[PDB]
RNA sequence: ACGAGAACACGUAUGCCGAAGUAUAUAAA
């Protein structure tokens, strides 16, 4: 699933990225991710709150909405396996895996931000 | 030899940007990932404004010379006569009450207000984005005061009263003139933690 | 830094995008007023009469009988008293669909800043032949209107005024005749001065007259309005069409080709009360 | 240095659209989710107008280097000059009276206003939706004045009252040209919160 | 929960959505729900004021009006149990449940928007 | 009865300063 983190370099075509993705269009997603990263990080146990499960549900909702608004975001989310990993993280409900997803997503964001028009 | 502890909470009125990291993020603890107010910020702003209160000539400004009793309170120990500092300002940390509050009501710990700049002769705008600590946040602070000279307690607490009151009418962090970072102090407390000194006649508003 | 006074010569509409369906009105065929209904007060009446389930089902699967597909009949079937039927009217004007204007927070109609510079821009572009008028758009500022009390709101039917008159199936609410509406004007480009703006509008109107307004003659509604409005003198007056509902036009061959392309016939209003037709849009503007 | 406070209220005459956060939303807080007027907006607008009132050559415009007295009033500290700002503007917050009024009259806080463009020689519309702060709402502000020197306070408040008048007949926010953004000022109050200066002869219209 | 998720994929037939549902057809409902959202957020206590109860009553009236206006909206509301959910919300008179309903309905709308012609 | 034994890498100062989320965008039918 790290090939999903370095697919970003395989997606530098001719020049636009992800067919015109800009990090600027990722802002709402980044904000929500940071919010719940902080909230999870302060948490003690590995078992997540049921309210936190509902929060993750709200994450998937927002991801789908953003994929609906913009096509480049849609390609980014679909081909990098974002949706299955979100579902899987919701399935295990363990803190460390949620942090693992957070590190993957942040690595994606930063590396994509390296290349922009 | 006694030490007096000063405790309370800082309530953010308008968004605050300390932001020592430099996008343009705020200082954050690396164990909780929450914003902090470095104690150097409090000490420096109190230093500066209570200095500008009293005499501060251009010669004093150039050589960084200040008033004898502000120097006494905050210490100089650079040249001339060495005065060891007397008020220890600690950092402030994001309180658990407000943590429960914002977790329950699902409110972000940081807003990213977007700002613009209209340059002249071109009127072309170039945007920027700034992180700012959400209002209603509460930070818990501690001060420690050392009694090196018994007879001077009243004057020193008078001056720190001046400092608190003047700070409440000023800013912390950046963008102070742009609206950012006004604070108020609330639920103060004075108590003798070490020694044999009474601290009942003391007050800080 | 000037105040602008607007004298509505004719019915003026600014479409809000809200199209009322077969609900929230009573259409009195026999006294010719339609009664908008406060949703809150009406439904809390329904609950003080515990008929809300009846009202809901009434709405839900309409009888498909056109005489039985309104709101007045729904209220009558429950024998609701006319005074209470007067108790539950939010506001009224003298209808399958009805088009509402923009409203402010307190349901108070106001004239937008988009419409007023819409007409003013159009006037400037035509007079100066688009002399960088897009740049001067930023240097001419129009404040929104003050509110418009419902003392000057009434419903009108869209009339297709050609050599034989035809009605459009729906209506549009409009401002009544002769209403006085003010806004405030600010100028950041002194070149297009107050008198310059007024003369630009006037020249636009005169060109409009000698191109199109002369052609609709020999139509009964035409010469009635054309003469009643006093347009031969109006060539001296500062008259302009605001908002929507004015003709699409607001040489002949190029106009024909363009109009074919666009559409790929005059819009006005006819009253029953006085049998007098007004074309939608024109109003008088004077500065101070 | 003493500090003189200015408090008051912005009345929303016609719509107001900041929209820094963006269908095309406006700037909103996150502790109450009720809109605000960022202080940066107010400060920038007043600075632009008051600069324009004084001299402004293409060179002044070239590098945001402005007339010396406005510079004194708002601070530059760029051209090797010691100038920290003397006038602090905070944010404006949806007031309590407004909230109660709109609750007990059942009126929303935000209008969603639909706009179109009509293409030339095309007559085809492309619609837009713009969301603006509802009219008649009031926001409250607080300003802080610092007296770095005694003998420019009257002149500086003369400048500020001129600026407030200019704002009272201008627009704050987005697209006042297209209609929204006129404001008015009510309930100006002048106190010297910290210091020994008198606030009786000083006035702002 | 996210029954919205699998329901939205259950309503993809042959292509029509809920027999032709479109996002333009729910604008008024979205506006009303948003206003009730902000008003309830402004509230402090969990007990719902009788005025907010009347707001919920008028919201129910508006669902019924729109469902009578169009058939596809009727099928959407009928299968998504909007009416039973609103009835239960009115019965409970708790603010948190109303916010949970808000999140559910937002997810519904987001899915409906992401799957469109 | 240990090339020992006394010995605070201490003291002074903050993320500052100027920046408007702007410009067009007839609510057509």
Contacts of A67 in chain E (CB under 8 A): 114
Using a 7 Å CB cutoff, list residues 94-123 of D near strand F: 114-118, 123
List the structure tokens of A61: 């909702």
Closest by CA to B188, choosing from B13, B12, B37, B6, is B6
How many whole angstroms from its chain centre is CA A6? 14
How many Å apart are CA D198 and CA D192, to the nearest integer?
Answer: 7
Closest Cα of chain D to E38: distance in Å?
7
Angle, helices A71-79 vs A50-69, to 10°: value is: 130
Q: Is B169 annotated as a binding residue?
A: yes
**Chains in contact with D, counting 3 or more C-beta pairs less than 8 Å apart as contact:** B, C, E
Alpha-carbon span D40 to D28, nearest angstrom: 14
Full residue range of the structural domain in which residue B136 is found:
1-205
Resolution of the coordinates in A? Answer: 5.0
| DSSP annotation of B89 | E
What count of other Cβ atoms lies within 10 Å of the Cβ of residue A8? 21
Domain total in chain B: 1
Report whether D147 contacts D153 (CB < 8 A): yes
Q: Determine whether the distance from the CB of D25 to the nearest atom of strand F is below 7 Å.
A: no
For residue E84, what are the CA distances in angstroms to D41, E60, E66, E79, E88? 47, 10, 16, 10, 6
Per-residue tokens: B105: 């009501």
Phi, psi angle pair for D118, to nearest 5°:
-110, 115
- Cα gap B82→B93, rounded to integer Å: 32
**Helix crossing, C52-60 with C39-48: angle to 10°?**
120
Task: Report the alpha-carbon distance of residue A108 to residue A38 in Å, rounded.
Answer: 18
Q: Contact B24/B131 with Cβ under 8 angstroms?
A: yes
Distance CA A69, CA A6 (A): 25
CA C160 to chain centre: 15
B105 Cβ partners below 8 Å, 6+ apart?
A: none
Q: What DSSP character marks residue A48?
A: P
Give the technique used to solve this structure.
cryo-EM
Residue E44: phi and psi, rounded to 5, are -90, -55
Q: Which residue has 């061959």 as its token pair?
A: C253
Cα–Cα dist C112/E102, whole Å: 33
Residue B188 contacts residue B142 (beta carbons within 8 Å): no
Query: Annotated binding residue at D190?
Result: yes
Give backbone dihedrals phi and psi of B150, rounded to 5 degrees, phi first. -65, -40
How far, in Å, CA of E111 to CA of A60, rounded? 10
In three state form, how does the secondary structure of chain D look?
CCEEEEEEEEEECCCECCCCCCCCCCCECCCCCCEEECHHHHHHHHHHHHHHHCCCCHHHHHCCCCCHHHHHHHCCCCCCCCCCCCEEECCEEECHHHHHHHHHHCCCCEEEEEEEEECCCCCCEEEEEEEEECCCCEEEEEEEEECCCHHHHHHHHHHHHHHHHHHHCCECCCCCCCCCCEEEEEEEEEEEEECCCCCCCCCCC
Instruction: Answer for B61: CB within 7 Å of strand F.
Output: no
Residues of B within 8 A of D21 (CB-CB) are 113-114
Tokens describing residue D17: 């659209």
Residue C96: name the closest of C70, C119, C118 by CA: C70
CB D134 within 8 A of CB D99: no
Across the beta sheet with B183-194, what order do the strands follow?
A: B87-94, B138-146, B3-12, B183-194
Q: How many CB atoms sit inside 10 A of residue D198's CB?
A: 10
**How many Cα atoms are found within 13 Å in the side-chain-facing hemisphere of D198?**
2
Burial class (CB in 10 A: 0-12, 13-18, 19+), C103: middle
H or E stretch at A82: helix A82-92
Separation of alpha carbons C128 and C196, rounded Å: 10
Question: Which residues, at least 6 apart from A86, have a Cβ–Cβ distance to it below 8 Å?
Answer: A56, A59, A60, A63, A101
């Amino acid at each position: 699933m790290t090939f999903a983190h370095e697919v970003v370099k395989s997606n530098v075509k001719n020049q636009v990225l992800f067919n015109g993705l800009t990090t600027s269009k990722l802002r709402n997603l980044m904000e929500q991710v940071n919010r719940l990263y902080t909230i999870a990080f302060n948490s003690n146990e590995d078992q997540l709150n049921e309210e936190f499960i509902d929060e993750l549900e709200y994450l998937k909702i927002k991801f789908y909405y953003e994929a609906g608004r913009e096509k480049s975001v849609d390609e980014f989310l679909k081909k990098t396996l974002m949706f299955p990993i979100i579902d899987r993280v919701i399935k295990k409900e363990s803190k460390k895996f949620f942090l693992d997803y957070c590190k993957y997503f942040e690595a994606l964001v930063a590396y994509a931000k390296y290349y922009q028009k | 030899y006694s030490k007096i502890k000063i405790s309370g909470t800082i309530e953010v009125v308008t968004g605050l940007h300390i932001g020592g990291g430099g996008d343009s993020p705020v200082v954050r603890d690396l164990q909780t990932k929450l914003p902090i107010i470095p104690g150097s910020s409090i000490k420096g702003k109190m230093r500066n404004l209570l200095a500008k209160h009293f005499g501060l000539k251009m010669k004093q400004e150039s050589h960084n010379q200040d008033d004898e009793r502000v120097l006494r309170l905050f210490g100089s120990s650079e040249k001339g006569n060495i005065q060891r500092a007397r008020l220890q300002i600690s950092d402030a940390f994001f309180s658990e009450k407000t943590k429960e509050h914002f977790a329950q009501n699902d409110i972000a710990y940081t807003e990213t207000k977007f700002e613009n700049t209209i340059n002249r002769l071109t009127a072309v705008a170039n945007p920027r984005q700034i992180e700012r600590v959400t209002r209603g946040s509460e930070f818990d602070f501690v001060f420690i005061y050392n009694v090196d000279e018994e007879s001077q307690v009243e004057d020193d607490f008078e001056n720190i009263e001046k400092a608190i009151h003047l700070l409440e009418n000023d800013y912390l962090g950046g963008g102070g003139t742009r609206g950012n970072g006004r604070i108020q102090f609330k639920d103060t407390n004075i108590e003798t933690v070490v020694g044999e000194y009474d601290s009942t006649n003391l007050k800080i508003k | 830094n000037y105040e602008v006074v607007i004298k509505t010569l004719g019915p003026i509409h600014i479409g809000s995008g809200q199209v009322m369906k077969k609900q929230d009105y009573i259409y009195d065929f026999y006294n010719s007023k339609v009664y908008m209904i406060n949703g809150n007060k009406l439904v809390k009446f329904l609950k003080r009469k515990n008929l809300l389930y009846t009202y809901q089902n009434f709405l839900r699967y309409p009888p498909k009988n056109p005489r039985e597909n309104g709101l007045k009949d729904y209220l009558d079937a429950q024998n609701v008293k006319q005074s209470e039927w007067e108790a539950f009217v939010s506001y009224s004007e003298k209808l399958n669909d009805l088009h509402l204007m923009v409203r402010d927070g307190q349901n108070k109609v106001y004239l937008p800043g988009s419409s007023i510079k819409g007409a003013i821009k159009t006037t400037l572009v035509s007079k100066y032949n688009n002399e960088k008028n897009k740049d001067i758009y930023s240097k001419i500022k129009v404040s929104d209107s003050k509110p418009i009390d419902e003392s000057n709101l009434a419903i009108y039917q869209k009339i297709d005024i050609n050599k034989s008159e035809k009605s459009m199936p729906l209506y549009r609410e409009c401002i009544d005749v002769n209403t006085e509406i003010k806004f405030k004007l600010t100028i950041e480009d002194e070149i297009y001065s107050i008198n310059e703006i007024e003369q630009s509008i006037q020249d636009f109107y005169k060109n409009y007259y000698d191109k199109w307004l002369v052609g609709f003659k020999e139509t009964k509604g035409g010469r009635r309005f054309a003469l009643e409005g006093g347009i031969p003198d109006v060539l001296n007056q500062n008259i302009l069409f605001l908002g929507a509902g004015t003709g699409f036009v607001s040489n002949r061959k190029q106009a024909k080709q363009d109009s074919f392309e666009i559409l790929t016939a005059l819009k006005g209003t006819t009253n029953q009360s006085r049998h007098t037709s007004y074309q939608q849009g024109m109003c008088k503007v004077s500065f101070q």
